[PDB]
Amino acid sequence: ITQQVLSENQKLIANKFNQALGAMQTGFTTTNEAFQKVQDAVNNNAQALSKLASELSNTFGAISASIGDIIQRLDVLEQSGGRGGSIPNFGSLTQINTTLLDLTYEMLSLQQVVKALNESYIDLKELGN
Amino acid sequence: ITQQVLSENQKLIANKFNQALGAMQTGFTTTNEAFQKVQDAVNNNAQALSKLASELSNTFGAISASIGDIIQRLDVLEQSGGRGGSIPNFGSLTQINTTLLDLTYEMLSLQQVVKALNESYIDLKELGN
Amino acid sequence: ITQQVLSENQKLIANKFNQALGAMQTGFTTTNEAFQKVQDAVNNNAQALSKLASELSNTFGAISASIGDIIQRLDVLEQSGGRGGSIPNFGSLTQINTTLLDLTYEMLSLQQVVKALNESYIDLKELGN
């Protein structure tokens, strides 16, 4: 253990740390890119479900009215004083409550983390005077 | 390269490392908060889909029965010995198989990672005696 | 501040760094495992929605045709030259556009990050000659 060895070991530590830093930045950048894709996927399929549900209600409405008009035509033909089958109630779908994913705070945070990691690099210039 | 320079460089390395540590903790904490929001979003929209599907089957059931009762009334009026259009089969929806997201192991793990990072901080007290 | 103290402090720094490294690997491995579960969950529920939507269109088709056949039987009984209620249009559902989650690039990247972190470990063998 000499001083040359000490300062050479300092370089080993600094380089290993700088090596790890680059890996962290990649990790958090990749994590961030993944969250963006997840947010977009989840939101797209929630909007499709919400849209379908409204088109479904729109369809059931036309079916129910059509059936109602058929029952009213049966009664006219039956001449039974409206003693046939009453017009049924088909209820309604529950308004879909969808959760939209908003990871804008989290994604900007990871953007800043990678950035702060970049400020942590050990410049070999500042070592050994 | 003197000893003062060596110990001053040690402080540079330690501080840069402590600087990076804080960034890692933020990164994994933010990642954890994001996963919680993703889990809640995915699960909420899967429960909405599952609920809709059951209300849809409930609606188709009332429609099919109503149509069946209309056909039976047509036959009575037609007096053709039941030679009109038979009552159609409208099948049934496939039971929705939804996947619920359970990231409780993963989220507790990230909680522990941030915690273990905190145990890795270099206290300047232990340097230079 | 002696040389023994300098090299002992080097060990403290190296060990603290190696300690943090293990935590990073756990963090990015856990993050990766979580993304896999998210991808599988999101995709499974998108396929269920897509399947339901097709079975819904298949059901509406049989309902509409059945209603059309009922109207045509009403007209035959009414003998009014087809002056009753016309056959209604029930439209069609919009083809569901679902987004499938493909995080294969991102998940292989995190696999490599953990791996590159492993190459950053400071082996105490290379210190102090």
A20 to chain C, closest Cα gap in Å: 6
The structure was resolved experimentally with: X-ray
B122 to chain C, closest Cα gap in Å: 7
Contact A13 B13 (CB under 8 A): yes
Decide: C103 and C39 in contact? Cβ < 8 Å: yes
The rounded distance, in Å, linking the Cα atoms of A106 and B32 is: 9
Contact C27 B106 (CB under 8 A): no
The rounded distance, in Å, linking the Cα atoms of A113 and A124 is: 22
The rounded distance, in Å, linking the Cα atoms of C47 and B97 is: 10
Burial class (CB in 10 A: 0-12, 13-18, 19+), A97: exposed
Contact C13 A13 (CB under 8 A): yes
Residue C96 belongs to domain with CATH number? 1.20.5.300
A67 to chain C, closest Cα gap in Å: 8
Host H or E run for residue C63: helix C3-78
Nearest CA in chain B to A70: B70
Q: What is the domain count for chain C?
A: 1
The rounded distance, in Å, linking the Cα atoms of A40 and A34 is: 10
In sequence order, the 6+-apart residues with CB closer than 8 A to the CB of B37 are A101, A102, A103, A106
Q: Find, among C36, C25, C51, C54, the residue nearest to C101 by Cα.
A: C36
User: CB-CB: which of A17, A42, A128 is closest to B38?
Assistant: A42
Contacts within 8 Å (CB) and 24+ apart, B118-121: B118/B21, B118/B25, B119/C19, B120/B21, B120/C16, B120/C17, B120/C19, B120/C20, B120/C23, B121/B18, B121/B21, B121/C16
For residue B89, which residues of chain C lie inside 8 Å, CB to CB?
A: 62
User: What's the domain range around B44?
Assistant: 1-129
DSSP state of B125: G
Neighbours of chain B (3+ CB pairs under 8 A): A, C
